[PDB]
Design a protein around this ligand. Sequence first.
Ligand SMILES: NC(=O)c1ccc[n+]([C@@H]2O[C@H](COP(=O)([O-])OP(=O)(O)OC[C@H]3O[C@@H](n4cnc5c(N)ncnc54)[C@H](O)[C@@H]3O)[C@@H](O)[C@H]2O)c1
Ligand SMILES: NC(=O)c1ccc[n+]([C@@H]2O[C@H](COP(=O)([O-])OP(=O)(O)OC[C@H]3O[C@@H](n4cnc5c(N)ncnc54)[C@H](O)[C@@H]3O)[C@@H](O)[C@H]2O)c1
Ligand SMILES: Nc1nc(N)c(NC(=O)Nc2ccc(C(=O)N[C@@H](CCC(=O)O)C(=O)O)cc2)c(=O)[nH]1
Ligand SMILES: Nc1nc(N)c(NC(=O)Nc2ccc(C(=O)N[C@@H](CCC(=O)O)C(=O)O)cc2)c(=O)[nH]1
Lengths: 292, 292
Amino acid sequence: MEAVVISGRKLAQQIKQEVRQEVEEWVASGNKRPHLSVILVGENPASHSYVLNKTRAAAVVGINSETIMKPASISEEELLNLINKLNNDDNVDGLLVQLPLPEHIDERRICNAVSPDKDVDGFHVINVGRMCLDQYSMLPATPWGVWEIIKRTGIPTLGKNVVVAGRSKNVGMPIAMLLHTDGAHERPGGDATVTISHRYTPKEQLKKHTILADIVISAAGIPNLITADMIKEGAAVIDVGINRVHPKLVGDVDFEGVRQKAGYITPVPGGVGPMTVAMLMKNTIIAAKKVL
Amino acid sequence: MEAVVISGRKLAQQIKQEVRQEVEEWVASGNKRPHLSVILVGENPASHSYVLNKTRAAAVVGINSETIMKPASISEEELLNLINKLNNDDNVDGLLVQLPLPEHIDERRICNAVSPDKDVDGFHVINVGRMCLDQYSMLPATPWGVWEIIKRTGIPTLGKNVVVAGRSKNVGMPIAMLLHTDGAHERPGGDATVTISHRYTPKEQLKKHTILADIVISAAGIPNLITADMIKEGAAVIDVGINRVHPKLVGDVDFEGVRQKAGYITPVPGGVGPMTVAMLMKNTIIAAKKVL
Ligand SMILES: NC(=O)c1ccc[n+]([C@@H]2O[C@H](COP(=O)([O-])OP(=O)(O)OC[C@H]3O[C@@H](n4cnc5c(N)ncnc54)[C@H](O)[C@@H]3O)[C@@H](O)[C@H]2O)c1
Ligand SMILES: NC(=O)c1ccc[n+]([C@@H]2O[C@H](COP(=O)([O-])OP(=O)(O)OC[C@H]3O[C@@H](n4cnc5c(N)ncnc54)[C@H](O)[C@@H]3O)[C@@H](O)[C@H]2O)c1
Ligand SMILES: Nc1nc(N)c(NC(=O)Nc2ccc(C(=O)N[C@@H](CCC(=O)O)C(=O)O)cc2)c(=O)[nH]1
Ligand SMILES: Nc1nc(N)c(NC(=O)Nc2ccc(C(=O)N[C@@H](CCC(=O)O)C(=O)O)cc2)c(=O)[nH]1
């Protein structure tokens, strides 16, 4: 079978065009231009590259952005101080702290310091609790991106079988939460039958579940975790992995094998990555309009 | 095969004996006896019967209890007023509001009014968020009960297949959250591979998942949902359903059929019900000692 290769870049262009229109109508009428603040700690090159993609996307949709660079040596107290100032500044609509942080800093304490109304990553414990109760909330950008790839392509979820490989609190768990929950709730879900797997799932048991799946979502960070023999013909396969191997970028899916069996497949790069960035822009216009 | 019929009543007696010892050592030394307050609204007979089981269990383990009876006609404002007084009373260690409430009352607002330190049901949004991040929290009594049945019987979960029938925010979702999460986190999980199913799961797809399961947990409220042909030989089957049929009580599992195929089975009544009550007593001694 010849899989349709879904272009995340094209879909993200569509979403960015919608955000720009909303922003330019808001500013034309004399309202404040929206503003996003990013705190970046240390010198990790991939972190610097992701934050650049985020601030360029803001530029192109009419959102002002600032990147605050701090050394890896900063204390927890200093970083909390800086977050309190941004929380109290009425020009600042969204605030996020790029992860990961240095070992001496408690990431959970930092995520809980960001005001929940400006928490455009959806990482504050109140935003996590609201999301797990299917209430209105700021949704994490990568999992919302995965959701939009599925919905805008027209792939059905109600009554369908979904397997998620990965249980991380920022990616795998929220994807599983969105896809299994009730379509009639405040924040609608996808009404799918969902399996979550992880590092202690034996490979034989992962395979027995993925062969039943209409949609397989891999967010494990393991090259070639998903291969053609594990997929039922015509399934949708979404690759959320980003793996640097020796010096190259690859996903969790053996693309070249699975493209011969799936009905739909996302590439790495150029799939979920651009969709993460686009959904962040949507969260920022939502924070700026104060409707949540 | 002859299934071992697990006695929830015997297991709950063991847990209540442990709680009584802890309470009587605490009071012998001159500390305040623990105290649990229950608010019961309206005249639902099953609600009145569950609350009686709760206050009798408190009596037998040395915990003082009060049941506050209010008419179904009470306003949201009056009920919030009463919760504020109990929250501010230092004699009161645990506070819970029996559900369901009348249609004119917003249950979510009421659950979020209970102080999170006295929230022995685990229903406040902060307790829900902490639980979904695998942090120390007050766990909901029915899902903790299900967990204790599995652990005290000696049934393994790490790398095993689990199916949960039901996605309710007070029962099915928390059971799924506890069983799939990491054993090394602050609040350890069970490291199982978990499928969640619900009202839009077709019966044919429920069956294709349950035949792979080492543990099947039914929390749907549908008589005879689980039948012998859906179970692999030697599996553990936990019945969390409580269904009044015409005038009789039954679970979600066809007990008489599944007892011939499973390795372990819980009865209704006398299974998960007594374990819900016992784990509530454990949450109350935890709230009274102020260690969380
Ligand atoms: N926009 C994007 O595309 C985007 C954004 C963030 C992260 N990611 C990628 O997602 C992947 C994981 O991201 P994360 O934030 O969850 O990091 P993480 O490393 O915490 O995730 C690892 C998760 O995968 C699970 N896992 C490990 N081995 C497994 C196996 N053999 N089978 C099944 N599951 C297994 C773990 O138990 C854990 O939950 C990485 O490749 C990362 O680069 C992509
Ligand atoms: N201690 C105890 O034993 C205890 C405590 C509370 C509730 N319960 C029982 O648990 C059952 C459900 O409790 P609840 O609080 O979740 O109430 P609920 O009625 O909200 O739960 C129904 C859930 O089951 C799902 N469901 C409905 N039909 C289904 C089907 N055909 N296949 C799979 N799933 C389906 C729904 O989508 C929903 O998530 C009831 O029988 C109730 O009496 C037992
Ligand atoms: N706070 C916070 N920290 C985090 N670490 C994340 N994750 C978080 O930024 N991920 C991410 C991953 C990839 C890209 C990206 O632009 N990917 C492109 C280009 C790949 C590359 O340059 O290597 C692609 O996949 O096509 C953007 C963001 C987040 O959303 N919030
Ligand atoms: N706030 C709040 N509201 C709620 N509705 C619940 N659920 C909530 O009390 N369930 C429950 C169910 C059954 C029994 C019980 O004692 N069952 C016995 C006897 C059955 C009967 O008398 O009908 C058994 O199954 O063996 C106790 C509590 C809760 O935990 N907290």
